[PDB]
C-alpha cells in the first residue's frame, strides 16, 4: 500500500442516536493524563438502562479497497457486561460478502494488563469495491469510526530501523 | 445417520451447513430456532451452529451456505447429527490415488 484516504465511515455524532457514544474511554488509553481511546474506533455502550440491538451497514462506493477495523470487547465480570451493554447474553456479528463471522462476549478472569482485567480483540477486513459490510450487535462492539480507502503500490514494505530520515 | 467406509479406499465426503437470513426462515425451514448440525469421523469432528444474519444478497440470496469436505479413511465411520441446517451428502466419491497429476489453467483445446 503506497497511500490511502482516511474517511469517517460512521460519523460519531450522527450514526448512533440510540446508543451512548460519549463514554467509551479508558485510563489504559490515556491522553494528556486523562482517559481516552483510539481515534479511529468508537466504543458504543448503553444509553440509559438499555442497549437495543444495533444494525448498521456501509456500502463501498469508493472504487478501491477499503480497510475496515473494529473490535469486540470482553469484560472481566458479568457486572461489567450489565453496566456496559445491559445484555448478559449479547453478541456482535459482522458480515461482508466475503468476510462473515459472528462473535460472542466471553466474560472471564484475566490477569490485569495495563490495569485491565478486560480484553478487547481488534479485527480487520478488506471490503471490496461494491461490497457492503453490516454490523449487528447487542453489546460488546467497538464500532469502526474512521476507515481507509487503499491505493495499491508495489515494492514498498516495512522495515525496522533506527537510522535517521 | 452414519456411513461406514467399507470401500477399502479413501472416500471424500462433501456436505453443507446452511445459514438463513431471518429467524422466520429458520422456522419455516427447520422449525427449530436453536438447531445445530454435528459431524464426527474418527479423525474429523466438528459441531456447527446456524448463525442467522443480515447479508447482502448474492445471487439473490441473503442466506449463505458453507460447503465442507473430509476424507473418511477405510474402516472409519462418519456420523451426522442434526436438528436443522444440514445439507446432507447425497453422492460421495471413493478415491484412487495417482501421482504427478495436477490441475492446470488453460484455454488451449484438447
Amino acid at each position, epitope marked *: 500500500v503506497s497511500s490511502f484516504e482516511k474517511f469517517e465511515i460512521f460519523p460519531k455524532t450522527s450514526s448512533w442516536p440510540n446508543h451512548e457514544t460519549t463514554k467509551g474511554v479508558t485510563a489504559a488509553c490515556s491522553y494528556a493524563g486523562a482517559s481516552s481511546f483510539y481515534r479511529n474506533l468508537l466504543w458504543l455502550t448503553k444509553k440509559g438502562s438499555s442497549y437495543p440491538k444495533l444494525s448498521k451497514s456501509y456500502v463501498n462506493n469508493k472504487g478501491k479497497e477499503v480497510l475496515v477495523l473494529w473490535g469486540v470487547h470482553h469484560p472481566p465480570t458479568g457486572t461489567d457486561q450489565q453496566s456496559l451493554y445491559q445484555n448478559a447474553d449479547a453478541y456482535v456479528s459482522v458480515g461482508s460478502s466475503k468476510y462473515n463471522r459472528r462473535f460472542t462476549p466471553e466474560i472471564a478472569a484475566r490477569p490485569k494488563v495495563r490495569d485491565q482485567a478486560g480484553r478487547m480483540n481488534y479485527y480487520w477486513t478488506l471490503l471490496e469495491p461494491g461490497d457492503t459490510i453490516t454490523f449487528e450487535a447487542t453489546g460488546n462492539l467497538i464500532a469502526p469510526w474512521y476507515a481507509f480507502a487503499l491505493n495499491r503500490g508495489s515494492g514498498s514494505g516495512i522495515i525496522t530501523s533506527d537510522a535517521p530520515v | 445417520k452414519s456411513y461406514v467406509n467399507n470401500k477399502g479406499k479413501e472416500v471424500l465426503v462433501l456436505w453443507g451447513v446452511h445459514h438463513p437470513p431471518t429467524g422466520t426462515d429458520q422456522q419455516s425451514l427447520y422449525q427449530n430456532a436453536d438447531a445445530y448440525v454435528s459431524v464426527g469421523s474418527s479423525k474429523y469432528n466438528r459441531r456447527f451452529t446456524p448463525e442467522i444474519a*443480515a447479508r447482502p444478497k448474492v445471487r439473490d440470496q441473503a442466506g449463505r451456505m458453507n460447503y465442507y469436505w473430509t476424507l473418511l479413511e477405510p474402516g472409519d465411520t462418519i456420523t451426522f447429527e442434526a436438528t436443522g441446517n444440514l445439507i446432507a451428502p447425497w453422492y460421495a466419491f471413493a478415491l484412487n490415488r495417482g501421482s504427478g497429476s495436477g490441475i492446470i489453467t488453460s484455454d488451449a483445446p484438447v
Partner: antibody
Amino acid sequence: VQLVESGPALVKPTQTLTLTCSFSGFSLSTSGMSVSWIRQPPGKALEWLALIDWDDDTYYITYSSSLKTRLTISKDTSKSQVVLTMTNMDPVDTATYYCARTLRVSGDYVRDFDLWGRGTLVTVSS
Amino acid sequence: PVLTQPPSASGTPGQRVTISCSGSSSNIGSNTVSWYQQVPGTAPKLLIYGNNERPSGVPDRFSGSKSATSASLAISGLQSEDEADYYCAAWDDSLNGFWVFGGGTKLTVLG
C-alpha cells in the same frame, strides 16, 4: 404509557407556536425512549420535525432548511413533557402536529415510532 | 434527502401487494427501515420495525425486506381493513442525522 399533544389551535402568521406533549402513565420498565415531533398537512405526507432523547439530552432537528432555524425542542423530565417551539409561523405550516415515541428495549431493535399521540390541528391564519 | 414511494397501488382481496421504498446510501443504505400504516386523518400505527420485527399484535401477513438502498413492504392475503396509506421510514446519517419518511402510498382494496 400515554401521550397528549396540546397547544394553541390558532396562531397568527409570524407568531411562535409552543406545542407540549404530555406523558401519562407509570413504568417499572428498564427502557429509555426518545420523543419525536412529526407533522402532517391535510391530505399530505408525514414530515418528521425533531427528536429528543429521554435519558440523554441529545437532540436532532430536520435538516430541512426552511425550518431548521425555527425549531427548538426541550424536555422537562420532572413534568414529563416535551416542548416543541416553532417561530415565524406561515399558513403553509397549518397542519396536524404529532408527538410520538421511540422505545428502546434492550437487545431488540428500536421501537421506532412506537406510540403516537392523537395529534393537534394547528391552523395559521389572520 | 427523500424516500420515494409510488403515489398509490392496488389489489384484489387475497393477493399479495408490495409497496416499494427507495432511498440512498446514508439512510436505507445504512439503517433499518420501519413501516407505518395510516387510516386517513387519524394517528399512524407502527407495522414493521427493525426491518420486519412486527410489533406485538400485527398479523404475520405483514412482512418487509431491505436490500441495497431500497426496501419493500409485503402484505399477503389482502383483506378489507388493509385499505389505508402506507409510509416507509429510515434514519439518515448525513448532516447531523435526521429521520425521514417516504411520500406514502395510497392502497385500495378492489372488488
